[PDB]
């Protein structure tokens, strides 16, 4: 029914430096693992999905993440873009949060937040027009901050749910239905 693009946030630079947040779990690595599970969960409901992950040990700087992602996002004729992130603060911040650009994006964001909110703290959908992944993407886009990578309790919940458990909540939210 929908053609969906899933980008994984951040990358591993040529230096070996990872550009993501890092805490009790590495953000990039977690989302590299989640992305294909999320895609398959969408696919089970009949949607088509492309997963976009930056090449590893190719980029000189983080600036190449935009240059890599944007043309591919914009050449695929997608109905929806989702970029997967994990949040971070000082260890005390926790919960789920979805960033959006438009009123259409807000609809998706709120439902995703409510679904994740069944397990994590619902921090709410938040408008951010400054992010390139949102302001330079043709399709409606949302940036999902599923939980905090520097909060033990959040990550313990995630490992309890599993990738499939997190995926199901995101998919139910985006699709506005119950999968069970």
Q: Is 128 helix (H, G, I), strand (E, B) or coil?
A: coil
Closest contact distance (angstroms) between CB of 83 and Zn ion is 8
| Residue 9 is a binding residue for Zn ion (CB under 5 A) | yes
Q: Is 86 helix (H, G, I), strand (E, B) or coil?
A: strand
Closest contact distance (angstroms) between CB of 150 and Zn ion is 12
- Please give, one letter per residue, the 3-state secondary structure of 13-51: CCCCCECCCECCCEHHHHHHHHHHHHHHHHHHCCCEEEE
Which residue of this chain has its Cβ atom nearest to Zn ion in the complex? 85
Closest contact distance (angstroms) between CB of 180 and Zn ion is 30
CB 97 within 8 A of CB 145: yes
Rule CB under 5 A: choose which of 85, 94, 123, 163 binds Zn ion.
85
| Residue 163 is a binding residue for Zn ion (CB under 5 A) | no
| Residue 111 is a binding residue for Zn ion (CB under 5 A) | no
Of the candidate spans 1-9, 67-75, 111-119, 148-156, the one that interacts with Zn ion by CB under 5 A turns out to be: 1-9
Site size for Zn ion, by CB under 5 A?
A: 2
Sheet containing 96-100, strands listed edge to edge, beginning at the edge strand earlier in sequence? 48-52, 3-8, 80-87, 140-148, 96-100, 122-127
Of the candidate spans 38-46, 73-81, 85-93, 124-132, the one that interacts with Zn ion by CB under 5 A turns out to be: 85-93
Closest to Zn ion by CB, 31 vs 41, is 31
**3-class SS shares of the chain: helix, strand, coil, % to 5:** 40, 25, 35
CB 123 within 8 A of CB 46: no
Closest contact distance (angstroms) between CB of 34 and Zn ion is 13
Closest contact distance (angstroms) between CB of 145 and Zn ion is 7
CA–CA separation, 21 vs 150, rounded Å? 8
Of the candidate spans 3-11, 51-59, 69-77, 134-142, the one that interacts with Zn ion by CB under 5 A turns out to be: 3-11
CB 125 within 8 A of CB 98: yes
Return residues touching Zn ion (CB under 5 A).
Answer: 9, 85
């Amino acid at each position: 029914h929908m053609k969906i693009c899933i980008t994984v946030g951040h990358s591993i630079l040529k230096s070996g430096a990872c550009t993501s947040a890092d805490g009790v779990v590495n953000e990039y690595q977690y989302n590299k693992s989640l992305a294909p599970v999320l895609a398959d969960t969408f696919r089970k409901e009949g949607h088509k999905v492309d997963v976009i992950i930056c090449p590893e040990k190719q980029f000189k700087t983080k600036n190449e993440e935009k240059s890599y992602k944007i043309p591919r996002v914009n050449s695929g004729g997608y109905d929806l873009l989702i970029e997967l992130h994990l949040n971070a603060s000082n260890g005390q911040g926790k919960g789920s949060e979805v960033l959006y650009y438009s009123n259409k994006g807000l609809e998706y964001a709120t439902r995703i937040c409510d679904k994740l909110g069944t397990v994590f703290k619902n921090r709410g959908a938040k408008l951010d027009k400054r992010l390139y992944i949102l302001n330079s993407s043709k399709p409606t886009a949302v940036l999902i901050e599923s939980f905090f990578c520097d909060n033990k309790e959040d990550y313990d919940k995630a490992k309890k749910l599993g990738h499939e458990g997190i995926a199901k909540l995101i998919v139910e939210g985006v699709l506005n239905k119950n999968i069970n």
